[PDB]
Amino acid sequence: RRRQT
Amino acid sequence: RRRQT
Amino acid sequence: GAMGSMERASLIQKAKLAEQAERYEDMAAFMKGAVEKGEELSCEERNLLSVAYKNVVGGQRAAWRVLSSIEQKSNKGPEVREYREKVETELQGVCDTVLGLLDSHLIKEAGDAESRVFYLKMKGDYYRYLAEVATGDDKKRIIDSARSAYQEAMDISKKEMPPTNPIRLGLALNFSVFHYEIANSPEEAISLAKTTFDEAMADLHTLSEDSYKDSTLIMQLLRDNLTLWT
Amino acid sequence: GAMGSMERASLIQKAKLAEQAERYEDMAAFMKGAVEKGEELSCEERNLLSVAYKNVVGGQRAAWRVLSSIEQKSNKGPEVREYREKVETELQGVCDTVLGLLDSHLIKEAGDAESRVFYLKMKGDYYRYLAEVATGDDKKRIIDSARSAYQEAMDISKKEMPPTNPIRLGLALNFSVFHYEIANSPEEAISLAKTTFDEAMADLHTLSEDSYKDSTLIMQLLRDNLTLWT
Ligand SMILES: N=C(N)c1cc(-c2ccccc2)c(CNC(=O)c2ccc3c(c2)CCO3)s1
Ligand SMILES: N=C(N)c1cc(-c2ccccc2)c(CNC(=O)c2ccc3c(c2)CCO3)s1
Ligand SMILES: N=C(N)c1cc(-c2ccccc2)c(CNC(=O)c2ccc3c(c2)CCO3)s1
Ligand SMILES: N=C(N)c1cc(-c2ccccc2)c(CNC(=O)c2ccc3c(c2)CCO3)s1
Ligand SMILES: N=C(N)c1cc(-c2ccccc2)c(CNC(=O)c2ccc3c(c2)CCO3)s1
Ligand SMILES: N=C(N)c1cc(-c2ccccc2)c(CNC(=O)c2ccc3c(c2)CCO3)s1
Ligand SMILES: [Ca+2]
Ligand SMILES: [Ca+2]
Ligand SMILES: [Cl-]
Ligand SMILES: [Cl-]
Ligand SMILES: [Mg+2]
Ligand SMILES: [Mg+2]
Ligand SMILES: [Mg+2]
Ligand SMILES: [Mg+2]
């Protein structure tokens, strides 16, 4: 999963 | 549901 | 220009990159440039042209329907109408661009039944998208232009293509939707979708596993519409 | 112009319409016009500005990452590099536009801690997006500009906002990601995300049901990153 912003 | 094209 | 200085092969390569990047406005501009080189579009390249403009006009049509619904409910000042008109005008510009590529000179240079049917189906589609937003002294002429293009495509496709051909199937699907929701001919829509579906099913026994998947994918869409309409 | 002839209230109304229509390029252009009128942006209007440009640059960044990955694998002629550079240049132009609105004159005119923090967080974000594609004699200066903007926002937010404030939380989330993947400071990223999460949790007892939902939504994102990183 991609990190969140 | 919407008709399909 | 603006794509006139770029090699045809580079434009095709970039259209494929743009598709991978989901940059469909770019994809369409690259394919417009490729068409304007004046040489054939292959099957793959015709698909690239169709997919690019399908996605561009698709976003515009979805936006137009949202704004049109808001406008209808409001009937707050002129802003809703103004912004709907802005989107509508941009949509019409894209349709005019595609129809101009078809008329100058994709269709007349299409020396194959399968290439000619592909382009005439597109001509029907983009006149239909114009008809969706038309409300003027030419909605009737626009509707007739769509029907005429579709009908000629149908005539050729029935003579020169098997009933399972996916371009033939997608043409009948869209002409059927034209009948149902543009021409106020729901019986014609149902008749066309049903005969098209049944004649494809009867021909599936002739196909490879891969062609069978291709054809049944579009058959599912015909079924979905008949299920909605009957 | 091009939005200079339109009323501020009409631009805000159209930005909201564009959002409903998922027309984020239009939304951003309307909000740029509203900013350039020279008056305050409300909380709602700041959210509209941020959402519009988030979606515009988000599509560009996703496209850039696709093209950059293809380019890396290819290392076919110059086309992949050329098209990546085209997308990159357009992305940089959007970042420069947003930073120009912040510097002329959103930030200096932000007479609230909550408005000033909002804009400084945006300044950090758009320098960070520039840093993602930077590879030049100024990547280091770009990274320092992002850190500086984020740090000032953090300083004000810790003095003037409760630890559950969603703008404060979203600022810490993004500054933490800056540390992890831009500044090569994964320990700083983990420290910031963890202290921010824990101090928000300890403050939840002070909140209404609605504020609690607001804060816990961003807390979930801090948790997701810590789960990835530890
Ligand atoms: N880059 C693209 N997009 C495409 C490239 C090619 C291609 C490639 C090599 C040779 C010939 C053609 C495509 C063929 N067309 C489809 O596979 C297809 C078309 C419409 C459709 C579905 C599938 C599902 C339902 O609607 S698509
Ligand atoms: N004669 C045929 N039956 C076909 C020939 C080719 C072809 C032609 C030249 C080179 C390589 C392949 C096809 C694949 N090309 C398509 O365009 C296609 C389009 C729409 C669609 C699907 C596929 C699946 C669902 O919807 S199909
Ligand atoms: N006006 C029509 N022609 C129809 C009328 C009726 C009907 C008649 C009496 C009672 C109830 C219904 C139909 C039944 N439905 C289908 O035959 C059917 C439905 C979906 C579908 C296909 C076929 C092929 C692909 O997907 S069709
Ligand atoms: N038209 C819009 N988009 C918005 C309008 C307003 C608003 C309306 C009236 C008064 C004040 C503000 C918004 C407030 N902001 C959010 O609700 C929000 C923001 C970021 C975020 C989430 C939620 C989920 C995680 O990331 S958003
Ligand atoms: N002082 C506060 N805690 C807030 C005050 C207002 C407000 C201000 C003026 C008018 C009406 C409402 C808020 C709603 N506005 C937001 O901008 C918001 C932003 C990002 C976000 C969420 C909400 C939820 C998840 O991520 S929150
Ligand atoms: N380098 C660090 N600081 C950490 C090291 C370890 C660890 C130590 C020994 C054994 C296994 C793991 C941590 C455990 N994980 C958390 O405490 C944690 C995880 C997700 C999360 C939150 C907290 C709050 C919100 O979402 S954190
Ligand atoms: Ca009947
Ligand atoms: Ca550690
Ligand atoms: Cl407008
Ligand atoms: Cl390019
Ligand atoms: Mg040449
Ligand atoms: Mg009009
Ligand atoms: Mg005025
Ligand atoms: Mg560059």
Q: What's the CATH code of the domain at D76?
A: 1.20.190.20
Q: Check C67 against D17: CB less than 8 A apart.
A: yes
Domain annotation covers residue C97? yes
- DSSP string for residues in D170-206: HHHHHHHHHHHHTSS-HHHHHHHHHHHHHHHHHHGGG
CB contact under 8 A, B5 and C181: no
Q: Does D3 fall in a domain?
A: no
CA of C3 to the centre of ligand 10 (A): 9
Tell me the technique behind this structure: X-ray
Tell me whether residue D207 is in a domain. yes
D76 is a domain residue: yes
Ligand 1 pocket check for C221: Cβ under 6 Å:
no
D80 in C contact zone (CB under 8 Å): yes
User: What is the rounded distance in angstroms from the CA atom of residue C142 to the CA atom of residue C186?
Assistant: 19
At how many degrees (to 10) do helices C139-160 and C113-133 cross?
160
> Any contact of B with D, at least 3 CB pairs below 8 A?
no
Residue C163 lies in a domain: yes
D neighbours by CB contacts (3+ pairs under 8 Å): A, C
The runs of H, that is alpha helices, within chain C are 8-20, 24-36, 43-73, 79-101, 113-133, 139-160, 166-181, 186-203, 209-229
Whether C3 maps to a domain, the answer reads no
Is residue C2, in this structure, part of any structural domain at all? no
DSSP state of D104: I
CA distance D73 to D65: 12
Ligand 6, CB within 6 Å, residue ranges: D 190, 194, 197, 222-223, 226-227, 230
Residue pair C127/C139 in contact (Cβ under 8 Å)? The answer is no
- The HSE-up count of residue D116 (CA atoms within 13 Å, CB side) is 18
Question: Which numbered atom of ligand 1 lies nearest the CA of C51?
Answer: 3
Per-residue DSSP letter, C107:
T
At a CB cut-off of 8 Å and minimum separation 6, what does C105 contact?
C38
User: Is the shortest distance between the CB of C214 and ligand 2 below 6 Å?
Assistant: yes
Domain count within chain C: 1
d(CA A2, nearest CA chain D) in Å: 9
Chain breaks in chain C (C to N over 2.5 A) after: 75
First to last CA, chain A: 13
Q: Is the CB of C55 under 6 A from ligand 1?
A: no
Is the residue at C1 inside a domain? no
- Residue from C141, C9, C10 nearest D81 by CA: C10
Half-sphere exposure (CA, 13 Å, Cβ side) for D75?
Answer: 10
Read off the tokens for D119: 């804009």
Domain carrying residue C93: 8-230
> In this structure, which residues have their CB less than 5 angstroms from ion ligand 10?
D 82-83, 86
| Residue among D126, D179, D224, D227 with most chain A CBs within 10 A, to mutate | D224
Alpha-carbon gap, residue D163 to D171, rounded angstroms: 11
State the count of interchain CB pairs (< 8 A) between A and D. Answer: 19
Resolution (A): 1.8
D112 vs A: CB within 8 A? no
- Token output for D63: 């496209």
